[PDB]
Amino acid sequence: MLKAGVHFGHQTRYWNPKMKPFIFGARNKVHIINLEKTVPMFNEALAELNKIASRKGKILFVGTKRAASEAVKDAALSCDQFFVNHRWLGGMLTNWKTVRQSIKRLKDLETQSQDGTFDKLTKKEALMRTRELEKLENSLGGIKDMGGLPDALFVIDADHEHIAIKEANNLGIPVFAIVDTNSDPDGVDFVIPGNDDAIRAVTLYLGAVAATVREGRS
Amino acid sequence: SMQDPIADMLTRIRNGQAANKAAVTMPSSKLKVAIANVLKEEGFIEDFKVEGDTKPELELTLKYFQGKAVVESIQRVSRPGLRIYKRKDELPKVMAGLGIAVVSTSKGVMTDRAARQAGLGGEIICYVA
Amino acid sequence: SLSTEATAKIVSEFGRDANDTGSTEVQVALLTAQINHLQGHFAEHKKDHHSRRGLLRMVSQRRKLLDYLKRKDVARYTQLIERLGLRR
RNA sequence: CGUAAAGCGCACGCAGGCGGUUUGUUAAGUCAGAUGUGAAAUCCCCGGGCUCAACCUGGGAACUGCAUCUGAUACUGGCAAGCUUGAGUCUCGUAGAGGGGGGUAGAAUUCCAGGUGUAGCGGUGAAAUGCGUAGAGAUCUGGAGGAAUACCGGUGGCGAAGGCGGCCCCCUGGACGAAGACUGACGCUCAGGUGCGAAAGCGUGGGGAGCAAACAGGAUUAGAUACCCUGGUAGUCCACGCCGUAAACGAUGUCGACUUGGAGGUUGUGCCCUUGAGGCGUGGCUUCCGGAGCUAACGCGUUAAGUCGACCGCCUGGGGAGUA
Ligand SMILES: [Mg+2]
Ligand SMILES: [Mg+2]
Ligand SMILES: [Mg+2]
Ligand SMILES: [Mg+2]
Ligand SMILES: [Mg+2]
Ligand SMILES: [Mg+2]
Ligand SMILES: [Mg+2]
Ligand SMILES: [Mg+2]
Ligand SMILES: [Mg+2]
Ligand SMILES: [Mg+2]
Ligand SMILES: [Mg+2]
Ligand SMILES: [Mg+2]
Ligand SMILES: [Mg+2]
Ligand SMILES: [Mg+2]
Numbered sequence: 001m002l003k004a005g006v007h008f009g010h011q012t013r014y015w016n017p018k019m020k021p022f023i024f025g026a027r028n029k030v031h032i033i034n035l036e037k038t039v040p041m042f043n044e045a046l047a048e049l050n051k052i053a054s055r056k057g058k059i060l061f062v063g064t065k066r067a068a069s070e071a072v073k074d075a076a077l078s079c080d081q082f083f084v085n086h087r088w089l090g091g092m093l094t095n096w097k098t099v100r101q102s103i104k105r106l107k108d109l110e111t112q113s114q115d116g117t118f119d120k121l122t123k124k125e126a127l128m129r130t131r132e133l134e135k136l137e138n139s140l141g142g143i144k145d146m147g148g149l150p151d152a153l154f155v156i157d158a159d160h161e162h163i164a165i166k167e168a169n170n171l172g173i174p175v176f177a178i179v180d181t182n183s184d185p186d187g188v189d190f191v192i193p194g195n196d197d198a199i200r201a202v203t204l205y206l207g208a209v210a211a212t213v214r215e216g217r218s
Numbered sequence: 219s220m221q222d223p224i225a226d227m228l229t230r231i232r233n234g235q236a237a238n239k240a241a242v243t244m245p246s247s248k249l250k251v252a253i254a255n256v257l258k259e260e261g262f263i264e265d266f267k268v269e270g271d272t273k274p275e276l277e278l279t280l281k282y283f284q285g286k287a288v289v290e291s292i293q294r295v296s297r298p299g300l301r302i303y304k305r306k307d308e309l310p311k312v313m314a315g316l317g318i319a320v321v322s323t324s325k326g327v328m329t330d331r332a333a334r335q336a337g338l339g340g341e342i343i344c345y346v347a
Numbered sequence: 348s349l350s351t352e353a354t355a356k357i358v359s360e361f362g363r364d365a366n367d368t369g370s371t372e373v374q375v376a377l378l379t380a381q382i383n384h385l386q387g388h389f390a391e392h393k394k395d396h397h398s399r400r401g402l403l404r405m406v407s408q409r410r411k412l413l414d415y416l417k418r419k420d421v422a423r424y425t426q427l428i429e430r431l432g433l434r435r
Numbered sequence: 436c437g438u439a440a441a442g443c444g445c446a447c448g449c450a451g452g453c454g455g456u457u458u459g460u461u462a463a464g465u466c467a468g469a470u471g472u473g474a475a476a477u478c479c480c481c482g483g484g485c486u487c488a489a490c491c492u493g494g495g496a497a498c499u500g501c502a503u504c505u506g507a508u509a510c511u512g513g514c515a516a517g518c519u520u521g522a523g524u525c526u527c528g529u530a531g532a533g534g535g536g537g538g539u540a541g542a543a544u545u546c547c548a549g550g551u552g553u554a555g556c557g558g559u560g561a562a563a564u565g566c567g568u569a570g571a572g573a574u575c576u577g578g579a580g581g582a583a584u585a586c587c588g589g590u591g592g593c594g595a596a597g598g599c600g601g602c603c604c605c606c607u608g609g610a611c612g613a614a615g616a617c618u619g620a621c622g623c624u625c626a627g628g629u630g631c632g633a634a635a636g637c638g639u640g641g642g643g644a645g646c647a648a649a650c651a652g653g654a655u656u657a658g659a660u661a662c663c664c665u666g667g668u669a670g671u672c673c674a675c676g677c678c679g680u681a682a683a684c685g686a687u688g689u690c691g692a693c694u695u696g697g698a699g700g701u702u703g704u705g706c707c708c709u710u711g712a713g714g715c716g717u718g719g720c721u722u723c724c725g726g727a728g729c730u731a732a733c734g735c736g737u738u739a740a741g742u743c744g745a746c747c748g749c750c751u752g753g754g755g756a757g758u759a
């Protein structure tokens with residue numbers, strides 16, 4: 001049944017009453033979530049997740065923190081999937097139409113990186129323009145092209161991603177997310193208990209989500 | 219002070235409901251029961267339960283349908299400070315007809331649909347919808 | 348506020364037996380006792396305004412209790428006030 | 436009715452209102468039916484008559500009411516007998532600036548007396564008035580007197596509110612906890628009524644160090660009936676009796692039931708190799724923060740300003756006036 005070796009639970013006091021039903025913890029000043037209730041939430045989780053991924057999966061593996069950002073620009077990034085691994089530039093969904101050209105400048109630039117003007121102008125402008133592009137790259141990588149409108153959303157840490165999720169809620173976008181003992185649920189349709197800032201429950205489920213979009217209907 | 223228990227029922231409900239509370243209990247009585255009945259028989263609660271003898275305990279199982287609580291509102295109407303009584307033709311109908319009014323009569327605690335058919339009337343205990 | 352020896356004595360003078368402690372008549376009598384005891388504390392002092400509040404309480408408590416009994420068993424009421432000596 | 440008009444300064448309680456839970460009885464409240472009555476006109480519905488209309492008229496409908504009779508008994512009221520959780524009584528303890536009385540301690544101030552010692556001290560923004568050559572201030576020693584209790588001391592504790600801080604004894608009120616034992620709805624609220632009620636203020640007597648309305652002097656100022664300075668009387672202290680008001684405020688009436696959380700403070704108590712200065716529970720009170728919810732908003736938020744009930748008090752534009 002279990003597969004999460006050592007993600008057991010996490011998070012001490014800072015608990016959110018509403019996250020009681022998914023708790024059975026009480027180990028030394030910290031809750032262990034209800035392991036045996038998290039897995040029935042891979043059922044439903046990766047299910048309506050894939051059930052749409054074959055209907056065609058457009059995702060947004062949204063998850064930040066200089067401590068798991070790169071481990072999101074991964075097979076999470078790779079597949080039928082888009083992502084954000086830095087500061088969730090607010091209104092990026094709700095104001096996509098303004099931000100849509102924050103994109104044109106990323107391309108119309110890199111498309112021009114080993115092309116267009118580049119080694120020319122000044123060797124001032126140079127890295128003094130790749131700073132324009134470096135900045136853009138993180139926070140606005142995964143976006144690059146959005147071909148199929150943001151369709152579901154998968155987030156690592158419910159509340160830490162206040163804004164992201166809120167926006168979804170506003171635009172009618174499923175929001176699949178894992179929620180720590182401390183975080184507010186109910187912002188999340190398909191809620192996933194368990195730790196949300198340890199190198200494992202990430203990768204595990206993260207990489208496990210990459211494994212279900214990346215395959216649904218050949 | 220304990221003075222009005224029927225409001226307390228109506229309330230413990232109203233409250234617990236709003237607290238998405240599974241069940242709820244309280245001191246029982248002939249009267250509390252007759253209503254817990256109509257409440258169930260009209261399908262506002264799952265099912266009641268009286269578990270005692272010297273110190274009886276009414277227990278109601280609440281209901282939640284969509285995400286909401288089934289009982290959208292529950293008010294007193296008569297009360298010690300001010301008793302209400304309606305004749306048959308003057309009986310009230312809640313939410314135009316949807317939801318109901320609990321009226322005690324010379325032939326027992328029954329709804330407004332009920333008492334209206336029975337062709338009588340009494341003390342209108344409370345409103346539910 | 349009265350002694351265990353003294354309070355006991357009166358339970359045992361008024362109730363069915365020591366243990367029948369909460370009998371109307373007993374309460375009343377052990378109050379009545381403390382009241383009269385007190386009459387000499389507030390004889391001196393007098394400006395013990397605070398303690399006084401407690402004493403009235405004792406009287407108004409006793410008063411309601413005496414009222415109860417009367418309604419209940421009038422027969423027991425009259426005996427009581429006679430024997431305790433009040434209600435001129 | 437927190438901050439806009441509005442919670443009585445606080446309490447106790449008569450009348451009054453309201454009242455847990457069970458069975459029987461009653462049939463007053465309540466409900467049902469029947470009968471009678473509810474004048475005609477008017478109103479309203481359908482018609483009819485004046486050339487139309489207003490107007491006139493037929494017939495219904497309606498008069499939501501009242502009474503009488505007979506019934507129904509769930510609720511309320513009455514009578515009866517109970518019940519134990521509401522409320523009391525009982526037992527051993529606990530914490531406390533809760534009250535009343537009496538006793539007592541040290542530190543300082545002022546004063547009185549004396550040693551040493553000598554021209555200043557004191558005060559301000561700066562000054563002066565004041566004080567010192569009859570020796571001041573400074574310092575040391577002895578004494579008198581009154582007033583308040585540093586450190587502890589703390590969003591600490593007690594009380595109904597007012598408000599209560601040295602130490603000790605005596606008298607005394609309340610609150611809380613742990614066991615079970617007793618009474619058995621004895622309860623909640625409360626107009627009228629009664630009690631209490633900071634400071635100031637009044638009356639007779641005391642008492643008087645420091646402080647200080649008034650008043651006097653010195654200054655500042657354009658003026659200075661002030662703020663500052665040097666003085667200082669009522670008063671501030673005690674007993675007895677008055678007065679009855681405060682932003683007497685949480686500007687939030689009392690009682691009860693219900694409703695996610697988080698970190699403390701304080702005070703009981705059960706359990707754990709007491710084997711840790713603790714470990715896990717379980718009551719009372721208290722502070723901060725915050726969820727729903729509530730709010731005009733600020734904010735409140737299990738100590739509600741949320742959700743409901745019982746009763747009381749109070750508001751109805753500003754000024755006039757809490758005046759006549
Ligand atoms: Mg006001
Ligand atoms: Mg008040
Ligand atoms: Mg009853
Ligand atoms: Mg007529
Ligand atoms: Mg005509
Ligand atoms: Mg009855
Ligand atoms: Mg001295
Ligand atoms: Mg001296
Ligand atoms: Mg005591
Ligand atoms: Mg007085
Ligand atoms: Mg005075
Ligand atoms: Mg005087
Ligand atoms: Mg002066
Ligand atoms: Mg006043």
Ligand SMILES: [Mg+2]
Pocket residue numbers: 684685
């Ligand atoms: Mg205050």
Ligand SMILES: [Mg+2]
Pocket residue numbers: 736
């Ligand atoms: Mg708060």
Ligand SMILES: [Mg+2]
Pocket residue numbers: none
């Ligand atoms: Mg709390």
Ligand SMILES: [Mg+2]
Pocket residue numbers: none
């Ligand atoms: Mg309230």
Ligand SMILES: [Mg+2]
Pocket residue numbers: none
């Ligand atoms: Mg006047």
